[PDB]
Amino acid sequence: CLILVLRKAMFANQLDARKSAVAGFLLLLKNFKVLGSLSSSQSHYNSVANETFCLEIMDSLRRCLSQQADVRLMLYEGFYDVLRRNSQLANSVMQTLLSQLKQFYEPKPDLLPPLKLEACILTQGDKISLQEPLDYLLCCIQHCLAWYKNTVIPLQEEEAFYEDLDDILESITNRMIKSELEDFELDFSQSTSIGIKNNICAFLVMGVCEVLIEYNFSISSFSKNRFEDILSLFMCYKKLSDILN
C-alpha cells in the first residue's frame, strides 16, 4: 500500500509532493537490507523478495530521475547513503548514473567539452531553469566510486565499467585542463535569459571543476603531473570565480 501511494504520488504536479515521494523512496530502499553480501551495518528471511523489491524500486527511480532539478538534487544527495547502507544496489546505481553520464559525456577524447549546455539546462518558453546538475552527478559518482574502491574491492565479468568510469573522469580531467572560456561562451545576469543560462553554466563548470579537483587529489597519490593538473584546474576555477565576481 505504501509503495502504491508513492508511485501514485510520483506524477502529482506539486513540487513538495514529488520531493516527499522521492525521499520516501530513497529512505525505504535504504532501510530494506539485501541479505546477499551487504556490507555490515552503519534483514527479512525472504532475501530474493528483498532483492527483486529493491530492483523494481530502482526501476521506479529510473522513472524518477527525468524530472525537475530539485528531485534530481535530492536523488544524488541520497544515493551515497543508499550505497553506504546497501551495497548490492550500487551495481545498478552507478550504471544508472553512468547512463546519465552517457547522456552528457561525449565519447571522443578529441572533443573539447564534457558538458553540453543545451541538454544540461531546461530550455523552455519565456524562462530558463536547471534540469540536471552535472556537478552533482560527478559529485555522487566520485563519492560512490571512492566508497567502492575503498571498501568492496579490498573486501573481495562486470568490473570493467569501474575503470571505464575512472577513464571517463580522466578524460573529463584532461579535456577540462585543455579547455577555455571560448567553448562555454563566457566573458551575464538576470536581465536576459542568455545571461541567466550563462550564469547557470558558470555555476555548473565551477562545481564540476572542484569535483574534478576532488577526484584528481583522490587518485593521484601525490604525483607531480597529477598535482600540476590540479593546479591548472584550480586556476581555471579561480578565474571563473573572479569573472563571476
Add this chain to the structure above:
Amino acid sequence: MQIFVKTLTGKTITLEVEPSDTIENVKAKIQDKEGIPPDQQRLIFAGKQLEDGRTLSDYNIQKESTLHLVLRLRGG
C-alpha cells in the same frame, strides 16, 4: 436492476446488481469492469458513506440508482 456509477469528471458506468447483493460484490464487480482495486475506492449515496460489509437492501437503492464513486488516490 441496473445502477449508474458516476465517477469524478462526469463519467457514467452502467452495471447490473441484484437487490440481494452486497457492497462487497459491488466493489468486486467494479474491479472486474474498471480495474480499480476494491479497497482503494469508495462509494457514496444520498451523501451518506456506504458502510462496508452491509447489504445494499438496507440502503434505499432502487432502479436506476445513482452511486457516486470517489478514489482516495488520484488515477486509481
Add this chain to the structure above:
Amino acid sequence: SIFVKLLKISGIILKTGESQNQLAVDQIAFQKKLFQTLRRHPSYPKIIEEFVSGLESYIEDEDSFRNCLLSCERLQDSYSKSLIKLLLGIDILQPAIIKTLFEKLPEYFFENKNSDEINIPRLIVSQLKWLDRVVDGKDLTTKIMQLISIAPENLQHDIITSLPEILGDSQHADVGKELSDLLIENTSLTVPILDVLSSLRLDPNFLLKVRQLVMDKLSSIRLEDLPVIIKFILHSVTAMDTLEVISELREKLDLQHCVESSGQSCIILLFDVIKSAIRYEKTISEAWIKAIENTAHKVFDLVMLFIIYSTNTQTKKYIDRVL
C-alpha cells in the same frame, strides 16, 4: 517464429487459451536477460526489426491479443504483471510497441460497440500507464491527439482521464495548450479537461487564459459538474489573486438556484473538495475569512465558515471573534 523463439528463450512461457502466460523467472530477470540477449545478438537493427515484425505477426489473432494484454501468472514452487508491460519496460522496444498498440486500436473501435467480455481500449490504456520513460514526447502527443480526434466520446474521455499517468514530465506545456485548443473547439469533454488541468503541472500564466474563459461559465453549469471545477479554481490560483477569485466565486454560486439523492451526494462532494483545499492552502483559507469580512449572509458561506472553524485549529480564536 524468431519473435516466438526469442520470447521462449527469454524464459516467459507463452500460454494460449484460458491459461495465462507463466513466468519462469522474475520480471526484472526477464527484462535483463532479454535486453542482454538482444544487445549481444548479431545484427542489432535487423534482429530488432524482425522481432517487431514477428510480434505484430503473432498479435494478429484476437485470442492472442486478448491473452497477451492481460496480466501474466507467476510460476514458482511477488505479483505478476502483463508481458506487454514487461516489453514496455525495455526502453529500446518502446516506440515499436506503442506504434503497434496505436495502429491496433482503430481495429477495436468497432469491437468497443459489441465487446461485452472486456473493454479493449480501457485495458490498453491500463497497461500503458505507469511507464518508465517517454522515448518520444512528440510521438505520444500525436498519437493521443489522433485518438482524441477519431475515437468516440467514451474512449476520448477515458484517455483524457488517464492522461496524467501516460504523459511524462516533458509534454506538459504543449499538451496543455492543445487541450485548451480543444476546449475552445468543443464543450462536451470540457470537465475532464478541467480535471487534468487541475492535476497536471502548468504555469500560472497559461492557467490565466483558461481561468478567464471558465469563470464566465461558472454561473451556468449544473450541480453535477461543479466540484471538479472549483477543485481546479482553488488549486490553480496565485498568492495575490486569492481575494478576487474568492469573492467572484462566492458571488457566482449556483447552489442558490440549484438547491434527488444525487444532488445531496454532489453537495457533500463539493464540501469534501473544499475541505481538501482549505486544509493546506493557507493563503486561500485566510483569504476566505478576509473576503467575507470585507463582504460583511449566504448559507453556503456560513457552512464553509463552520467547517473552517472545525478544521483549522489556528483560526479557532480568530474565527470565534469574527463570528
